[PDB]
Amino acid sequence: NSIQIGGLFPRGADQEYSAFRVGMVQFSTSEFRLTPHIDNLEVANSFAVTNAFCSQFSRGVYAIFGFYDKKSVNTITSFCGTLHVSFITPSFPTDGTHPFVIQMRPDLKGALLSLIEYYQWDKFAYLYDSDRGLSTLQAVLDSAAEKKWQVTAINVGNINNDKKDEMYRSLFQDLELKKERRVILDCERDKVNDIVDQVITIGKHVKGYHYIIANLGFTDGDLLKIQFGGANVSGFQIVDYDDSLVSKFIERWSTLEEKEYPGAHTTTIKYTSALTYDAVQVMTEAFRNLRKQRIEIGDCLANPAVPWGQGVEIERALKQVQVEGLSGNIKFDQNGKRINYTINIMELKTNGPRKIGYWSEVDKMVVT
Amino acid sequence: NSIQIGGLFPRGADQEYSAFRVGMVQFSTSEFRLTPHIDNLEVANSFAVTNAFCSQFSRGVYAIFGFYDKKSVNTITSFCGTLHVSFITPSFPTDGTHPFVIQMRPDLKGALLSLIEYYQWDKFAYLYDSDRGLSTLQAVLDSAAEKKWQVTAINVGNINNDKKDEMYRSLFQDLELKKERRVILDCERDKVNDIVDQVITIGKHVKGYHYIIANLGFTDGDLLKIQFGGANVSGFQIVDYDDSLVSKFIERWSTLEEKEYPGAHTTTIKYTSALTYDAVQVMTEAFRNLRKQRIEIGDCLANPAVPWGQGVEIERALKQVQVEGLSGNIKFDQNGKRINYTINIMELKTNGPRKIGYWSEVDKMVVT
Numbered sequence: 172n173s174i175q176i177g178g179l180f181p182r183g184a185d186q187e188y189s190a191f192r193v194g195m196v197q198f199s200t201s202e203f204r205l206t207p208h209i210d211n212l213e214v215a216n217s218f219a220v221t222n223a224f225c226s227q228f229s230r231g232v233y234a235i236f237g238f239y240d241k242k243s244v245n246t247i248t249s250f251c252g253t254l255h256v257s258f259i260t261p262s263f264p265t266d267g268t269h270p271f272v273i274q275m276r277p278d279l280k281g282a283l284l285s286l287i288e289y290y291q292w293d294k295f296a297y298l299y300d301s302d303r304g305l306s307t308l309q310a311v312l313d314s315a316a317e318k319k320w321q322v323t324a325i326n327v328g329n330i331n332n333d334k335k336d337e338m339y340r341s342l343f344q345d346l347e348l349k350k351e352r353r354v355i356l357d358c359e360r361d362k363v364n365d366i367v368d369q370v371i372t373i374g375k376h377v378k379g380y381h382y383i384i385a386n387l388g389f390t391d392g393d394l395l396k397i398q399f400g401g402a403n404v405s406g407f408q409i410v411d412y413d414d415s416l417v418s419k420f421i422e423r424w425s426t427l428e429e430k431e432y433p434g435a436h437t438t439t440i441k442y443t444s445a446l447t448y449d450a451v452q453v454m455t456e457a458f459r460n461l462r463k464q465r466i467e468i469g470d471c472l473a474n475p476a477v478p479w480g481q482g483v484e485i486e487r488a489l490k491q492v493q494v495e496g497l498s499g500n501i502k503f504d505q506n507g508k509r510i511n512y513t514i515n516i517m518e519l520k521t522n523g524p525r526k527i528g529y530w531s532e533v534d535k536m537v538v539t
Numbered sequence: 540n541s542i543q544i545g546g547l548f549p550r551g552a553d554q555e556y557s558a559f560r561v562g563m564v565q566f567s568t569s570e571f572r573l574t575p576h577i578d579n580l581e582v583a584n585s586f587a588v589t590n591a592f593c594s595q596f597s598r599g600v601y602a603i604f605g606f607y608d609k610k611s612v613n614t615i616t617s618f619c620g621t622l623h624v625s626f627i628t629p630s631f632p633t634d635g636t637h638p639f640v641i642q643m644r645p646d647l648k649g650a651l652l653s654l655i656e657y658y659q660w661d662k663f664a665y666l667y668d669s670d671r672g673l674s675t676l677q678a679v680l681d682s683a684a685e686k687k688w689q690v691t692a693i694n695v696g697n698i699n700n701d702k703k704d705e706m707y708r709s710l711f712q713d714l715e716l717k718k719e720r721r722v723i724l725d726c727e728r729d730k731v732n733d734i735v736d737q738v739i740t741i742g743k744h745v746k747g748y749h750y751i752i753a754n755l756g757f758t759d760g761d762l763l764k765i766q767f768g769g770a771n772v773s774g775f776q777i778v779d780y781d782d783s784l785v786s787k788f789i790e791r792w793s794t795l796e797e798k799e800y801p802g803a804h805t806t807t808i809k810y811t812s813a814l815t816y817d818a819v820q821v822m823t824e825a826f827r828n829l830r831k832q833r834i835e836i837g838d839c840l841a842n843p844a845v846p847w848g849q850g851v852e853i854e855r856a857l858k859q860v861q862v863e864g865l866s867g868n869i870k871f872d873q874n875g876k877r878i879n880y881t882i883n884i885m886e887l888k889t890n891g892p893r894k895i896g897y898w899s900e901v902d903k904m905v906v907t
């Protein structure tokens with residue numbers, strides 16, 4: 172009795188798709204199996220996302236796993252909400268009410284604000300990507316008013332890859348001389364290197380800097396292979412490689428064939444890929460729970476809109492799932508947001524990245 | 540030889556629709572006439588906007604006049620760009636590349652930055668609406684870094700209409716005591732009153748405040764009927780009631796029947812309605828120019844996408860239009876952005892709102 176689902180993957184999301192496939196093997200059974208229909212697309216393109224979503228809807232899927240970005244998130248939220256089709260995603264979470272969107276990614280804003288306070292910063296630069304979210308900007312600016320921080324918030328987004336050389340010159344002119352060496356990096360991975368390299372290049376107090384990397388994958392990729400030149404570096408991690416569940420997963424992931432599973436055959440996994448694997452567990456558990464409870468379960472532009480009648484039952488089952496995964500304890504509130512999770516707080520130290528503590532909604536920051 | 544166009548109106552946009560209809564009467568001829576197909580919808584709803592756009596596309600329209608907001612703008616940009624359907628709009632302009640979107644509204648960021656500098660502010664609050672744009676935020680924060688301003692940027696958006704009373708208490712706690720009385724209001728009209736009333740309510744230095752209203756309709760509605768309590772108030776205006784063209788328009792608008800034309804029978808017109816009237820002139824002129832040049836001119840989700848072959852000819856004709864309208868000189872760059880326009884700079888003075896100067900891209904601010 173195969174369960175039809177959609178998968179909407181950004182082009183080039185190879186490791187995430189490998190993790191998706193490993194999840195299907197691990198969490199599938201002899202009798203029950205998810206049957207995915209995969210669309211690879213440019214998620215920044217709302218026409219493309221709309222077309223993929225509607226195609227999946229017309230096929231008759233029971234849920235869609237996928238990604239969105241800043242430009243397409245409203246298409247996903249509006250179509251899911253209108254048609255009662257559940258969308259499970261590792262993409263950035265949103266604060267608004269969004270029925271039918273299950274957000275695997277824990278919110279990071281609270282942990283970031285707690286870390287700023289932990290280091291007792293009161294003056295710092297916030298370098299963010301216009302090509303990324305803005306919920307974190309807002310939160311930082313709003314906290315600055317309350318906490319009396321002096322924030323220099325520079326949208327490092329939309330760089331012509333041309334004037335780049337000198338959009339950094341004016342950037343560091345403001346910082347370097349204002350003797351502002353506490354810096355939060357909230358952008359795409361590549362722009363991190365591009366900014367850090369600009370600090371060592373114009374060699375000045377290179378080691379006097381302290382960077383906070385505002386993402387959930389501090390130790391992902393060769394991120395920490397950069398030449399920070401003795402500067403302090405801190406960040407966040409949702410995948411704890413010392414946890415029993417993660418260690419067992421890596422025992423397998425580390426042995427996989429690269430040809431079959433691009434991005435595997437390593438001892439680490441990107442947090443987005445980990446969340447993708449966890450999403451498969453969540454979906455499998457939801458459908459298994461519908462079976463236990465004996466709950467039996469086509470035109471996108473049809474007018475009037477015909478929402479899926481059973482949609483609410485699947486949405487409910489998904490949000491009621493409680494399991495442990497690669498991203499720790501997984502539990503959802505009624506709006507599809509992660510709750511009762513933990514984010515590990517990391518510092519780059521003499522012998523490599525080290526966990527110095529953790530953050531939860533209830534307790535805020537706890538030092539190990 | 541009627542020309543089929545679409546019209547996508549927000550529910551309750553009565554004056555704008557009246558101005559649209561008055562435009563059709565004024566700019567239509569005996570032989571050539573625009574035949575609009577109107578959809579009234581919630582523009583914040585991307586499903587609804589997608590459905591309306593696709594319905595218009597399948598009808599065979601030659602262009603669409605309409606509105607979007609922050610949540611639906613990407614649907615409009617992506618669908619227009621993909622299908623080569625031109626969208627002419629009074630809604631907020633965007634900075635990205637957007638083929639096939641003609642933005643009637645002049646950019647305001649430059650004028651705002653020039654006005655801040657004119658008053659020689661170096662410390663101020665920027666109160667903005669999360670339920671509005673963020674391009675202006677970015678620009679202000681980016682200028683603050685360069686100009687060494689101290690900006691307190693508070694997202695007054697998303698107020699539960701409940702905790703409101705005390706989300707203002709914490710708001711003014713930060714401001715009132717930090718003796719920050721220079722304030723930029725960049726939000727929806729209603730939230731202006733809601734914020735100003737909170738200043739007079741907690742009566743303290745009420746007259747020591749200076750507000751800048753960041754919109755293009757300083758004298759629109761009863762906006763300036765508020766009790767500012769002697770505070771200074773400045774703003775922007777794109778409709779100049781002393782200009783000959785505007786005066787002639789008002790000679791008619793002031794006599795119209797309210798029953799037939801809701802929002803008319805007044806001596807003023809909201810800037811959004813003025814831009815709507817101007818959009819009709821622009822569309823009429825474009826199609827007339829296609830005729831002069833002897834240039835002869837259905838499934839939204841069709842795969843592969845089938846762009847309209849003649850789409851590029853209409854897009855070109857629209858962007859080449861150069862006329863005077865209610866919003867002054869109308870001319871477009873290749874990205875559909877207004878250029879060579881003028882924004883009037885206004886202050887509220889003893890005898891009412893007064894023009895103190897103007898701003899253009901080329902000259903920045905000029906004092907009268």
Ligand SMILES: *[C@@H]1O[C@H](CO)[C@@H](O)[C@H](O)[C@H]1NC(C)=O
Nearest residue numbers: 502510511512531532533534
């Ligand atoms: C789980 O989360 C809720 C809401 O954040 C919190 O109130 C509750 O105390 C948490 N439970 C535990 C055991 O941390």
Ligand SMILES: *[C@@H]1O[C@H](CO)[C@@H](O)[C@H](O)[C@H]1NC(C)=O
Nearest residue numbers: 870878879880899900901902
């Ligand atoms: C019109 O706009 C362009 C670009 O902003 C500018 O370079 C040009 O000088 C302007 N023309 C006049 C007469 O202001």
Ligand SMILES: [Cl-]
Nearest residue numbers: 347350376379
């Ligand atoms: Cl120094």
Ligand SMILES: [Cl-]
Nearest residue numbers: 715718744747
């Ligand atoms: Cl005082």
